[PDB]
Subunit: 289 residues, 3 copies
């Protein structure tokens, strides 16, 4: 019943995408009071203050922020609290998972995203480390990232479930096939329904000793989440995502979480941040009946 | 096939929400002509001219009393009463008038909200957040005993569809009193078709069914112009299908369409959708 | 894997609806480069340069005659004809061209409308509301006998998907001729996966299948820029899935994407969606 929130206003990569405004927008949407109202004790750790290379853009700075984030997430779990990380770009998951991995020996990851973020420096069309954060956490990529806060893979391929994917690069599709990553693409979600997708996901991770939720708001359709770094049409509805959070809450398996890629520049009256807060409310136990 | 239409441009409560414009907006969207096009004889009755714990209590009772008698009289004439809403507190008057003609009356409450508050549980004092509870006999005597000193509807004959913004007190009432409610999560899991089949079967023992359709049951993407929008609601397609299934079951014997708010609407499209839903309810088919 | 693309910027009928802008908007959205990215050889044939009961009948026959002969030549060259639309009346010319090479042709009509009117049942005189009926052999002889004095398509080989704005006489035609139609209510009851599986099975005995995709089949939320928007339509997700299922069935031998109207569009997103649906049709997988 105890949560520590940390904001990471990082917007790095080929060009700014505005996702450094995410933590501020989510706070504007009342995330702290929302979780407190459910009955949690909430500790706001604040935001990390963030002060050439084409294949790995802003690598030194990404590594510096992720090292600080990993140690802060590590210490939140040492204190027995739930770490809730608020994102700019999805490369902060490299630091989040490195910190979480200090405390779990068989960690599940649910990656809720339009993208797989499974690129390496060889397969990336852009050099964006936020398009590499899941691959790096699986142990594939640059040593500065893969060995960050620990010289070992933070997550095992058999413990990942990707939900919402619809903009995978060709090299990511090969990785998924060759490595046997469990992926629910939009076409499978249309065929199965989100209820069946979430039951299969929870069953697939039943053996883990904790589960990290890495929720990129661009998993949702731009109609429901216009304010994201890289919008991709054809995504999950608010209703589907809200139901998914409620099913995860009922299963009581989520032990850490991050909500990333909110971009106020493309948002409409902050409504993507408002939606992110509602999804967190559902994740942390709000019920409709 | 005979329908009488009455508008009630009521917008009371803590503050104006703009829903008094609903009847004018729905008429602008051509509701009369649309119903006549289907093959109905339509009589337009026009519009009714209109403390912090029960806000505007005296005025709400006055309007609902007049509405109750007009709805009663429409049914006495053998006609279907269709009520065009401002706020949902007019359901108190509508159900009081309908209850004069049915002793096991069913109600389908299509709404983002339960409207199950009382004086004690309401965080606002808005009577439009109390109209279902009052119609069940729970609430202020001015409301529960309006146009007849008895409960107008039985708890076992209510189905709420669309719920997603229930207060804690309403959740307790639903659980402790056994109200049948399909929240948005249950609709997602079951699908609208199965929700409506179960609803129609649940009300099988009734002698009539009143449809109380609050446009804020639909998602704000499809119905932006409502008094109190709540994200994550029903689609136009789900609602249009639900109306077609009700039409085919031929169980709806009175209806009201409430809470259209032109101030938040986009080129009247919420009112246009309300008319399309009425067209489906009254027998329009796609094939 | 050879495709020939032709644009037909036709916007005839009672009044302008802006659909003559469709081919330019779809090209602006990168249709040619997109098809090439998948691995196709793309020959760009350019654009064709362009009565009250059969409005603009003479001009429609002229354009449709030219389109039919170009479509003929594409199939004769062993290539896939992809037509980019203004009005849906261009289906008359497309199917006339296709039917020279397919005598048991299937047709998937993806549309909010049936386009099953004749000179007698039309409330408007718009030939774009008559193009399916005319291709079935019903209507004026200028259209019915266009580029061939025979019906281009058999009534038993038609599937309409997405219908929600049928005229009363069109409902009668569907009922009295046994036309297979999936309305929005059936799609909502069955789900799009089951609708497409049933569609594919229904056309099992055709020798080819023409996809005639009117963007107003999609809901105006996902496709605001169309000639005649009708609320309550198919989602982008449903349509993208349907295109993928057709791609894997490998039954589509010609296609047209019509009725994109830039005047009502929002930053060209309807044309962008059309290009995305073509990408799915021609083999893109998620
Ligand atoms: Ca804005
Ligand atoms: Ca407006
Ligand atoms: Ca525009
Ligand atoms: Mn440590
Ligand atoms: Mn991501
Ligand atoms: Mn992403
Ligand atoms: Mn009486
Ligand atoms: Mn209500
Ligand atoms: Mn309501
Ligand atoms: Mn058409
Ligand atoms: Mn059409």
């Amino acid at each position: 019943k105890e949560i520590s929130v940390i904001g990471v206003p990082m917007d790095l990569g080929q060009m700014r995408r505005g996702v450094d405004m995410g933590p501020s927008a989510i706070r504007y949407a009342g995330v702290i009071e929302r979780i407190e109202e459910i009955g949690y004790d909430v500790k706001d750790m604040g935001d990390i203050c963030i002060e050439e290379n084409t294949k790995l853009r802003n690598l030194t700075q990404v590594a510096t922020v992720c090292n600080e984030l990993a140690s802060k997430v590590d210490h939140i779990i040492e204190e027995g609290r739930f770490p809730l990380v608020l994102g700019g770009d999805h490369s902060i998951a490299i630091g989040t998972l490195a910190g979480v991995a200090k405390h779990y020996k068989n960690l599940g990851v649910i990656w809720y995203d339009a993208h797989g973020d499974l690129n390496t420096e060889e397969t990336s069309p852009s050099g964006n480390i936020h398009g590499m954060s899941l691959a790096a956490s699986l142990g594939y990529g640059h040593s500065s990232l893969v060995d960050l806060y620990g010289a070992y893979p933070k997550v095992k391929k058999e413990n990942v479930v990707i939900i919402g994917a619809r903009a995978l690069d060709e090299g990511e599709k090969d990785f998924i096939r060759n490595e046997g990553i469990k992926v629910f693409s939009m076409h499978e979600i249309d065929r199965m329904g989100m209820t069946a997708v979430m039951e299969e996901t929870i069953a697939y991770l039943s053996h883990t000793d904790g589960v990290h939720l890495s929720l990129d708001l661009d998993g949702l359709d731009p109609h429901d989440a216009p304010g994201v770094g890289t919008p991709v049409i054809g995504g999950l509805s608010y209703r589907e995502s809200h139901l998914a959070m409620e099913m995860l809450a009922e299963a009581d398996i989520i032990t850490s979480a991050e909500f990333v890629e909110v971009n106020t520049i493309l948002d409409e009256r902050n409504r993507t941040a408002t939606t992110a807060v509602a999804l967190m409310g559902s994740l942390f136990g709000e019920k409709l009946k």
